[PDB]
Design a protein around this ligand. Structure first.
Ligand SMILES: *[C@@H]1O[C@H](CO)[C@@H](O[C@@H]2O[C@H](CO)[C@@H](O[C@@H]3O[C@H](CO[C@H]4O[C@H](CO)[C@@H](O)[C@H](O)[C@@H]4O)[C@@H](O)[C@H](O[C@H]4O[C@H](CO)[C@@H](O)[C@H](O)[C@@H]4O[C@@H]4O[C@H](CO)[C@@H](O[C@@H]5O[C@H](CO)[C@H](O)[C@H](O)[C@H]5O)[C@H](O)[C@H]4NC(C)=O)[C@@H]3O)[C@H](O)[C@H]2NC(C)=O)[C@H](O)[C@H]1NC(C)=O
Lengths: 165, 159, 298
């Protein structure tokens, strides 16, 4: 019987790479990284192989603390197009890719992070690499791009908003 | 460029005790006044008994080079690192072994061998990656093969 | 309500506009009777006759739901009329309007370009050392070094030249010259090159001797014998012998400059490759010949 009105509204997700530097030798490097993030001018960003790349994925401009950002598959490409090949897997089903020796890792984002809405963020790290032509097993000498599928999630429903791993 | 700024916990001594500074220089080593040690980089030494000696700093590449990835021109039990510390790897094998190529030149016998490192590749369904560098070293032994030898005799008429 | 309740859905906030003539009845409602959940209207538009609510999506009695495509914030704009003054009377009917704000739930994100870095290594190295030889007087079987260096005329001086093989590829030794002198100086006069021209043992050729290259017990060894002698004006007995020794791999082809030759009724090569020695018969040496006279009977 009653009336019902409905409309759309924006909801945005943003991915950035951390550039925080350890305060002094001995600090917690993983924590120190996310104290700063690269800007657009800084790219393309040079990072040596095997080095830790700290990534932060975030919902922008929301104020509801019940929202939980959940990551799906996070992968890498040789070109800007995320559907382009070849691809390497960093996260699958929200949990580190298992067939990589230099295993990726999820970074807990607990109160120690001290974020206004820590639920809106999801952080993870991977070890820097370069793509190789499998036939010749030689460096492709091409840039790398990092991509993630994300979903905003609501706890208390029938769905789970955290990755079991 | 090769430099001798090696700290004392990882120095590899060069195998001639109480060698003089200029002799230690001749073997392509470093001398600090009290000791002789291998410098920073790749060092090649050919010794009198016909054995290769190679010293390689693991920091010649970024990221550092692993000791399994490196392989010589031929396979064998003696072709792996003979010794190693946290910073250097030491190879010691006969000039006959490990696929060494022998060349002939006028007055010198030339041995040649080659270190190559192979990327370890992670392969996935849709990609292939590596996190290693490459290391290639071509080293030779040029054994000079002529000398002036002498002897003496005394000949007396029979008596 | 048909066009009464409109909504704008923003990132953090919902903005609801209701027409003051909520029911299209010509008579405006009490803005105190219209509540979004339990929230009163925020402002008024005396020109558009619009009661304006603004609530962050988690406030004002909002229910949040999940679907495949979207997140849904569902509000309830409730109009509960109250008595029109001291009179216990109401002239409107109660109503509720459902306000929904949809938000795209799923997204994919990308980073900007990363550039991998590594330092490869490529260099060439050379190193040097010497092959080491031995030249030693030996015994009649070229088996042991001779304890003494003294000989009589007509004896054989047995000498062996060896290149020490150690771990090298099979080596062959060569003796391409030997100069005999009275003084240790190899250029001193008198001097006699009993071996010369790259291995030619010219003694047996010029002196008519049995001096020859006996044999090679191993490729890195070469045995030869030299029948003793003295110089014409020599008062001293000691004679100094200085030789050039060479070496190659056993796989190096025997050559006119890589040979060990001796004149035995014809130039002869130890190892049997006799033709190699053809060029030992050069100029510069004069074969000895004893004189001749006619036949007489004693
Ligand atoms: C956000 O990011 C997400 C993560 O990156 C994105 O999701 C990805 O989207 C891509 C593109 O759609 C998907 O790729 C497809 O995946 C399916 C299934 O993959 C499974 O396995 C992977 C393992 O890694 C899992 O991750 C995944 O979840 C699934 O379990 C593949 O089948 C697809 O391959 C086919 O399509 C591609 C093009 O898309 C072709 O290049 C390829 O050759 C394949 O072609 C098919 O070939 C078969 C034969 O093998 C054909 O079948 C034949 O058909 C004929 C005619 O009909 C006849 O019947 C024959 O009998 C029959 O055999 C078939 O017709 C071909 N189909 C084509 C060409 O379409 C492809 O790889 C990713 O899987 C997906 N990942 C995840 C995790 O979901 C998401 O899209 C992003 N969102 C946005 C908005 O950007």
């Amino acid at each position: 019987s009653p009336l019902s009105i409905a409309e759309l509204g924006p909801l945005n997700v943003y991915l950035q790479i951390a550039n925080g530097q350890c305060q002094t030798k001995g600090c917690d490097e993983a924590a120190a990284a996310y104290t700063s993030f690269y800007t657009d001018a800084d790219y393309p960003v040079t990072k040596v192989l095997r080095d830790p790349v700290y990534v932060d994925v975030q919902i922008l401009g929301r104020t509801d603390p019940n929202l939980v950002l959940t990551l799906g598959r996070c992968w890498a490409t040789t070109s800007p197009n995320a559907f382009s090949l070849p691809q390497w897997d960093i996260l699958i089903d929200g949990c580190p890719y298992a067939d990589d020796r230099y295993l990726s890792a999820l970074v807990p984002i607990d109160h120690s992070s001290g974020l206004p809405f820590p639920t809106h963020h999801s952080r993870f790290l991977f070890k820097m690499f370069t793509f190789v032509d499998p036939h010749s097993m030689e460096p492709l000498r091409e840039k790398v791009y990092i991509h993630c599928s994300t979903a905003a999630c609501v706890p208390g429903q029938g769905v789970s908003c955290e990755p079991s791993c | 460029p090769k430099s001798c700024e090696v700290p004392r916990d990882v120095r590899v001594p060069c195998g001639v005790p109480d060698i003089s500074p200029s002799a230690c220089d001749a073997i392509d080593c470093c001398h600090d006044g009290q000791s002789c040690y291998f410098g920073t980089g790749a060092t090649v030494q050919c010794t009198k008994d016909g054995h290769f000696i190679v010293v390689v700093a693991k920091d010649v590449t970024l990221p550092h080079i692993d000791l399994e990835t490196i392989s010589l021109l031929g396979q064998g039990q003696d072709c792996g690192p003979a010794d190693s510390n946290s910073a250097f790897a030491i190879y010691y094998f006969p000039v006959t072994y490990c696929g060494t190529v022998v060349m002939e030149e006028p007055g010198v016998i030339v041995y040649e061998n080659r270190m190559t490192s192979s990327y370890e590749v992670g392969v996935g369904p849709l990609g292939a990656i590596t996190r290693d560098s490459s290391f290639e070293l071509l080293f030779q032994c040029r054994y000079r093969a002529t000398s002036v030898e002498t002897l003496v005799v005394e000949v007396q008429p029979p008596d | 309500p048909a066009a009464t309740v409109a909504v704008e859905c923003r990132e953090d906030l919902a903005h609801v506009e209701a027409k003051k003539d909520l029911f299209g009845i010509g008579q405006f409602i009490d803005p105190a009777d219209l509540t979004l959940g339990t929230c009163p209207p925020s402002a008024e538009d005396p020109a558009a006759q619009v009661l304006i609510f603004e609530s962050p999506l988690q406030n004002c009695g909002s229910v949040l739901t999940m679907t495949e495509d979207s997140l849904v914030y569902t509000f309830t704009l409730n109009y509960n009329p109250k008595p029109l003054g001291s009179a216990p009377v109401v002239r409107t009917s109660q109503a509720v309007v459902i306000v929904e704000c949809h938000y795209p739930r799923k997204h994919n994100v990308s980073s900007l370009a990363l550039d991998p870095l590594w330092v490869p290594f490529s260099a060439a190295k050379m190193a040097e050392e010497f092959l080491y030889f031995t030249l030693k007087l030996t015994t009649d079987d070229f088996q042991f070094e001779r304890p003494s260096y003294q000989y009589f005329l007509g004896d054989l001086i047995h000498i062996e030249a060896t290149v020490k093989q150690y771990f090298h590829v099979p080596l062959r030794v060569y003796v391409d010259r030997c100069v005999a002198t009275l003084s240790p100086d190899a250029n001193s006069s008198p001097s006699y090159a009993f071996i010369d021209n790259y291995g030619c043992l010219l003694d047996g050729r010029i002196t008519g001797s049995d001096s020859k290259f006996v044999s090679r017990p191993a490729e890195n060894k070469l045995d030869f014998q030299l029948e003793a002698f003295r110089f014409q004006g020599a008062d001293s007995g000691m004679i100094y012998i200085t030789c050039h020794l060479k070496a190659t791999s056993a796989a190096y082809p025997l050559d006119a400059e890589h040979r060990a030759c001796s004149y035995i009724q014809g130039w002869k090569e130890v190892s049997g490759a006799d033709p190699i020695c053809a060029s030992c018969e050069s100029g510069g040496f004069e074969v000895h010949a004893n004189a001749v006279v006619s036949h007489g009977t004693s």
